[PDB]
A = this chain, B = another copy of it.
Amino acid sequence: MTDQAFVTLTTNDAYAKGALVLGSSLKQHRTTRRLVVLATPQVSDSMRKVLETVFDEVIMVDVLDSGDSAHLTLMKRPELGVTLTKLHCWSLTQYSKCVFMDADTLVLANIDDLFDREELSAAPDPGWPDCFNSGVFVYQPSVETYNQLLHLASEQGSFDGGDQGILNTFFSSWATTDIRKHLPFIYNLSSISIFSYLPAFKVFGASAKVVHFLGRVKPWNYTYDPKTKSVPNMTHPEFLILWWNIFTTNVLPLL
């Protein structure tokens, strides 16, 4: 494919490890779409060279630069450095449809059927299920929509510096219109690091297509032992082991 792509984001070498694992798992399950990562100059030169081997396009985004299209918005909203960088995913008009994926996500099965949905399709947030989690969503790249989100980010800002409030406000019809824009939760399982005794966790892998390590603790923060294959994730350790198995096999030798 050339008009559709998976888009991820990393602003440093830490989240770059998650993007490399996410990109690797997308290649493991054989996606016909392209793999794009939005990187910033804070990513080291050697880490960027590793991203070029796993991803088809490494697109540099520096909102701190005066010439960047979101810099004027950043001067008025300095707390949105990462958020405004992510919003650049709507400016990739060389694709007609994209799925954004957080760098702390992991693909367990082919999800190319996500391109059957329309903008904007996303999974419910596990805490407040009336809102959608912005870690995985189907969108349509548009210069116009990009400018409206920059405008909405200026007036609204963000309590935690994230983009969940801005996207939910702009796409305010998600909660009550078209059930087809409700992605199944298995396309964005963001409860693996929050809850331990969820009923769906009685199944190995929880029948998930995509798992999302939402929270303040990320997989690259754990200490791994490849000899034993071990490290609320203590009760369902398959997702931590899967992340580290792919990292040590696919990503670590490239470092």
Contacts and interface: CB of A to CB of B under 8 A. Distances in A.
Contact of A159 (B125, B159, B175, B202): B202
Interface string A165-197: 100000000011111001011100001001100
A199 interface: yes
Contacts of A127: 126, 191, 194-195, 198
A68 interface: no
A234 interface: no
Q: Which of A128, A176, A185, A186 has the largest count of B CB atoms less than 10 A from its CB?
A: A128
Contacts of A195: 127
Contacts of A129: 123-126, 129, 185
A130 B165 contact: no
Interface string A73-86: 00000000000000
A55 B171 CA distance: 42
Mostly helix, strand, loop or mixed at chain A's interface?
loop
Q: Which of A125, A127, A191, A194 has the largest count of B CB atoms less than 10 A from its CB?
A: A127
Interface residues of A, number: 28
Nearest to A130: B185
A131 B182 CA distance: 13
A200 interface: yes
A176 B175 contact: no
A125 B128 CA distance: 9
Nearest to A174: B179
9 contacts: A124-B130, A126-B127, A127-B194, A128-B191, A130-B184, A130-B185, A175-B185, A176-B182, A179-B179
Interface of A: 123-131, 159-160, 165, 175-179, 182, 184-186, 191, 194-195, 198-200, 202
Given A128-B198, A175-B185, A177-B179, 16 more contacts: A124-B129, A124-B130, A125-B129, A126-B128, A126-B129, A127-B194, A127-B198, A129-B185, A130-B185, A131-B199, A159-B199, A159-B202, A160-B199, A165-B199, A178-B179, A179-B179
